[PDB]
Amino acid sequence: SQQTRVLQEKLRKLKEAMLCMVCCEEEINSTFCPCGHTVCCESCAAQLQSCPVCRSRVEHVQHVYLPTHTSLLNL
Amino acid sequence: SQQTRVLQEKLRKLKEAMLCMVCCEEEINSTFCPCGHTVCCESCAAQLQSCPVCRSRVEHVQHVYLPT
Numbered sequence A: 001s002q003q004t005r006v007l008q009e010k011l012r013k014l015k016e017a018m019l020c021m022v023c024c025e026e027e028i029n030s031t032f033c034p035c036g037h038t039v040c041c042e043s044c045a046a047q048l049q050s051c052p053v054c055r056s057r058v059e060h061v062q063h064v065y066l067p068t069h070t071s072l073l074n075l
Numbered sequence B: 001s002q003q004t005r006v007l008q009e010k011l012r013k014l015k016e017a018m019l020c021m022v023c024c025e026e027e028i029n030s031t032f033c034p035c036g037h038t039v040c041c042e043s044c045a046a047q048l049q050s051c052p053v054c055r056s057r058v059e060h061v062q063h064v065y066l067p068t
């Protein structure tokens, strides 16, 4: 039904929000510290000197294990 | 249709996976450091000395700003 189409759209948008803002391909699994922005996969977070969201210096990257993780890289 | 029921269940499960595993009421927004398990809201994470997933000592809690 039309309701099925609406639900499919919501599901798609929620899944896309869990993907890396730089490569758009891998799941987010890294946090920039100390600011806390958690928007990249491990590969894209590794070379950034400053946070792509707030410009704060990246002192280090903390790996995050999230319950929503499903990709073969996070399992 | 039956697919409306299936998608509603999938969406509910994905939303529930983003809720704190201790209080079941607030969104996850905290990481236990250094282990990295990100399974609690800030209120439950502040009250745990050990990670509820792996039992590693919590050295500190890092707030996470997620796009969701």
Ligand SMILES: COc1ccc([C@H](N)c2ccccc2)cc1
Residues within 6 Å of the ligand: A016, A017, A018, A019, A020, A021, A022, A024, A025, B067
């Ligand atoms: C499959 O389509 C997507 C893949 C990844 C994104 C990602 N969350 C994003 C956030 C901000 C800026 C650009 C990408 C979005 C859509």
Ligand SMILES: COc1ccc([C@H](N)c2ccccc2)cc1
Residues within 6 Å of the ligand: B016, B017, B018, B019, B020, B021, B022, B024, B025
């Ligand atoms: C129906 O409301 C819920 C709220 C939160 C959870 C949560 N993800 C959880 C994970 C593991 C253990 C216990 C709770 C699940 C359902």
Ligand SMILES: [Zn+2]
Residues within 6 Å of the ligand: A020, A021, A022, A023, A024, A025, A026, A040, A041, A042, A043, A044, A045
């Ligand atoms: Zn990436």
Ligand SMILES: [Zn+2]
Residues within 6 Å of the ligand: A032, A035, A036, A037, A051, A052, A053, A054, A055, A056
């Ligand atoms: Zn930042």
Ligand SMILES: [Zn+2]
Residues within 6 Å of the ligand: B020, B021, B022, B023, B024, B025, B026, B040, B041, B042, B043, B044, B045
């Ligand atoms: Zn909680």
Ligand SMILES: [Zn+2]
Residues within 6 Å of the ligand: B032, B035, B036, B037, B051, B052, B053, B054, B055, B056
């Ligand atoms: Zn842990």
